[PDB]
């Protein structure tokens, strides 16, 4: 098998960049497209499809597109390929999960509040100048906007996409380093089984593949994946399962690497659930946080491969501070947890069951069982785990709001910015706000951080904003990741990126 075999999972949603907010779809999307910038293994952006990106003020942007780029259907990548895709993502009528990434652009409010009788379908701040040039006017200085231009929300789309976006999402056509295979025995995307990609011969950008293709195998169980790794039937496994964390070093030797990654994990309890809204719900979320022993779970369940949360972002990000005032809400304190739960009971006495739903295909069983048992023992309530088989179905129930319990969540960074760990999850309208948290004061504080002229002041304002999150506990931050990645004896040049994923394009296979 010339192709590199790596682990993945069925995407919950069609393969439309602005419609993808999860890592299963994301790891495919990022192989199929090339954006204005591309990111290296440490998350630094470089010009890719853009010939230049100019802004002196973080408000006005002039973007020129390199000539000669095309999609795999032969059509050219133009300024329109970007502007039309961004307007599609921003328009509320299209219900794109990545809509919030367009929020800084002037005119976003015309298209995003709702479908509306607004009569406007495009953003006034986004203006084509010529076939290979467009300008962007932001509502306010936005410190991360340039950095974000390597993210999938901003990928260009071919003209055909807009005539039938459902068809596009089933069979995407991109401009990136790989393309969907022309499989010799069935479709490239075998739903719930695998996706096969081959190099795109048109592509001459910054991420040229060093291998002959990629096969993302959609494992139902990470123990199966680990067994395949040890037998050489899998080439790269980006998540060693809990059952192997005390053993992977002896099993794999120098074919496994570990390190902090900008990924976190949270316990999400929708504010719409019984006993979990209003001030009552805030007190109960604070109680849950005090009822969980993060150091102990990190040591025993994860064998030291998770680090207890100290904020709502991740230890490895620029500006992170593990000693923020008020972060004591993230310390284990059973007496405090019981006091807070009782104070919530003063509003309305608790009744029923507290269930933590999770996707069993990614090794969460041990920690969810431990957290549920900790809550049960500290607070004296009926707390249980509620496994579901697949990430795709689990996320679908979270997104459509069918899910009727608490559930695990967590963010893998898209670019290295604390703001990017907060805006998609906790601002009022964000598509990845799974719990219905709304606090206009937090959104305002975060906007102030985005408007800072320097990264230093911006980081200070981000952490100021996180004081509100310590008070509201919109979700319960658990820990951030020490990624552990293993690979077979048939591949080399395996680098783990800043956000825990293999650097797929650069893997080599003899």
């Amino acid at each position: 098998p010339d192709v590199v075999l790596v682990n993945g999972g069925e995407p919950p949603n069609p393969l439309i960049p602005t419609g993808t907010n999860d890592s299963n779809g994301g790891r495919i999307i990022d192989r199929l497209f090339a954006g204005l910038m591309s990111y290296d293994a440490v998350g630094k952006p470089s010009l890719e499809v853009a010939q230049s990106i100019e802004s002196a003020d973080n408000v006005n942007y002039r973007i020129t597109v390199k000539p000669g780029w095309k999609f795999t259907d032969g059509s050219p990548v133009t300024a329109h390929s970007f502007v039309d895709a961004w307007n599609y993502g921003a328009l509320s009528t299209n219900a794109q999960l990545q809509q919030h990434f367009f929020s800084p652009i002037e005119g976003f409010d015309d298209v995003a509040g709702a479908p509306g009788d607004k009569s406007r379908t495009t953003m006034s701040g986004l203006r084509v100048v010529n076939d290979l040039e467009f300008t962007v006017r932001l509502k306010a200085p936005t410190i991360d906007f340039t950095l974000a231009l390597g993210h999938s929300s901003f990928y260009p789309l071919p003209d055909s996409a807009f005539r039938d976006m459902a068809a596009f999402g089933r069979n995407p056509i991109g401009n990136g380093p790989y393309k969907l295979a022309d499989g010799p025995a069935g479709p490239a995307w075998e739903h719930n089984v695998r996706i096969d990609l081959v190099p795109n011969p048109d592509y001459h950008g910054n991420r040229k593949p060093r291998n002959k293709g990629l096969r993302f195998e959609f494992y139902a169980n990470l123990d199966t994946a680990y067994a395949d790794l040890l037998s050489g039937n899998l080439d790269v496994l980006d998540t060693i399962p809990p059952s192997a964390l005390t053993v992977y070093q002896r099993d794999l030797g120098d074919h496994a690497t570990s390190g902090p990654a900008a990924i976190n994990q949270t316990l999400d309890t929708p504010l719409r659930l019984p006993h979990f809204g209003g001030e009552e719900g805030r007190l109960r979320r604070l109680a849950l946080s005090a009822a969980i022993n993060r150091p102990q779970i990190c040591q025993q369940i994860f064998a030291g491969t998770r680090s207890p949360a100290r904020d709502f972002t991740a230890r490895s990000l620029p500006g992170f501070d593990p000693n923020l005032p008020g972060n004591e809400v993230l310390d284990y304190d059973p007496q405090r947890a019981r006091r807070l739960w009782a104070q919530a009971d003063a509003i309305s006495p608790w009744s029923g069951r507290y269930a933590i739903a999770y996707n069993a295909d990614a090794g969460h069983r041990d920690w969810v069982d431990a957290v549920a048992n900790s809550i049960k023992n500290v607070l004296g309530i009926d707390a249980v785990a509620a496994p579901q088989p697949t990430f795709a179905g689990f996320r679908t129930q979270i997104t459509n709001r069918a899910i009727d319990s608490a559930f695990r969540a967590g963010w893998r960074g898209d670019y290295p910015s604390m703001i990017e760990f907060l805006a998609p999850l906790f601002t009022a309208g964000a598509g990845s706000n799974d719990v219905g948290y709304i606090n206009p004061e937090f959104d305002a504080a975060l906007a102030a951080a985005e408007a800072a002229p320097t990264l230093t002041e911006s980081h200070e304002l981000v952490n100021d904003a996180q004081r509100i999150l310590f008070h509201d506990m919109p979700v319960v931050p658990l820990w951030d990741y020490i990624s552990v990645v293993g690979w077979s004896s048939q591949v080399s040049n395996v680098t783990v990126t800043w956000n825990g994923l293999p650097d797929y394009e650069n893997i080599v296979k003899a």
Partner: peptide
């Protein structure tokens, strides 16, 4: 992205 939301993580598996």
């Amino acid at each position: 992205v939301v993580v598996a």
